[PDB]
Amino acid sequence: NHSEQTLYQLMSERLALMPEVAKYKWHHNLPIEDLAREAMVLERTVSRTTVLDPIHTKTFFGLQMTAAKAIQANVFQSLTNTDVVASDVRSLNDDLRPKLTLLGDQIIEQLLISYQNGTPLNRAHFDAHFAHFELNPQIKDGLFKSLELVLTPPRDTLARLEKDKTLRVGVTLDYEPFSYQDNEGNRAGIDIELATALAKEFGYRIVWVKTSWPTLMADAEDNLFDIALSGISITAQRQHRMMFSAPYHTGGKTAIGRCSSVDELNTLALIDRAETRIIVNPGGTNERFVRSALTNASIRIHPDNRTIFNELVSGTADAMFTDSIEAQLQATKHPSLCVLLDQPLTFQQKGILLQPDPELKKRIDTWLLDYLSSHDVSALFSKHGVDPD
Ligand SMILES: [Cl-]
């Protein structure tokens, strides 16, 4: 209630000063971007948010910075042939930036307060609050989802692993390119290789445990696995009772359907009509998206994520919302299929699902962050069919 609004008010007061920032920079022929300042503000923030997850915190303040630079670039458009004068500008260093610094610190204070009091968040309130800002949907989505994860606050799994050296890894094997079976029928994909490298680092052997999108969290709650990987989206709902690793992929949801359909389905407004038959796989973020985002289209839940795309080819449904990486893979695999939208509508990251053991999470992240620094995922991604655009 109270904290949520205050949080939104402070975030909006910052963005509202950004036209003034852009005018000063336009006057002094400065660029929007200033990496010095960005770095420094992000260290200041990290050091001041110790009790909060530092990945979620950096993503949240990171997307505020993106939003702010997008507003600046909109102003830049409007300034091209103007005569800005001293009289028209406000001081960047004595006026605006002090104000922005104060607001940032007040946002941190509200974060910590909300984090300790279990302030609940409402997407409708957020939407209403930021509706007038001139911001692409993914960035708006990102701000809300990241704020949700920041504000989300125990097993002895690592202790057991250290004794038995046997890592039980949950996989769905129904999401190419993350986890699937190859034409010999062996487990394959990004997440098979990542889990193999994690096990190797810790000197564990892997036991593979089959799970599903409908039974993921019950399986996790019953401790049927230690970790799980299969392109699993990081969500505040899934961090109710489990934990995640650092993210290893960033994207979000788009739509796929037939190329012969594109000119009638190339916008969310065109997709969400009662004519349109939506198909979706049960029990994960695809389902939770289409149930929340659509008001008109009909919604069929198809049992098997492996054969769902054939329904679009066959003409028994018209569109599916899924992750951008999956849509682009399936649009390459199927001549008749096309990505329908120009860009994704949501912000979402993939991570390793973990039993809630702090010490497990700590070790896994240390490994993962280092691993990502050193290879490109890009190449692992590309080996399982993912065009590195
Ligand atoms: Cl994606």
Numbering used by the authors: 24 to 176, 181 to 416
What is written in the article reporting this PDB entry?
Chorismate mutase (CM) and cyclohexadienyl dehydratase (CDT) catalyze two subsequent reactions in the intracellular biosynthesis of l-phenylalanine (Phe). Here, we report the discovery of novel and extremely rare bifunctional fusion enzymes, consisting of fused CM and CDT domains, which are exported from the cytoplasm. In γ-proteobacterial fusion enzymes, the CM domain is N-terminal to the CDT domain, whereas the order is inverted in β-Proteobacteria. The fusion enzymes of Aequoribacter fuscus, Janthinobacterium sp. HH01, and Duganella sacchari were crystallized and their structures refined to 1.6, 1.7, and 2.4 Å resolution, respectively.
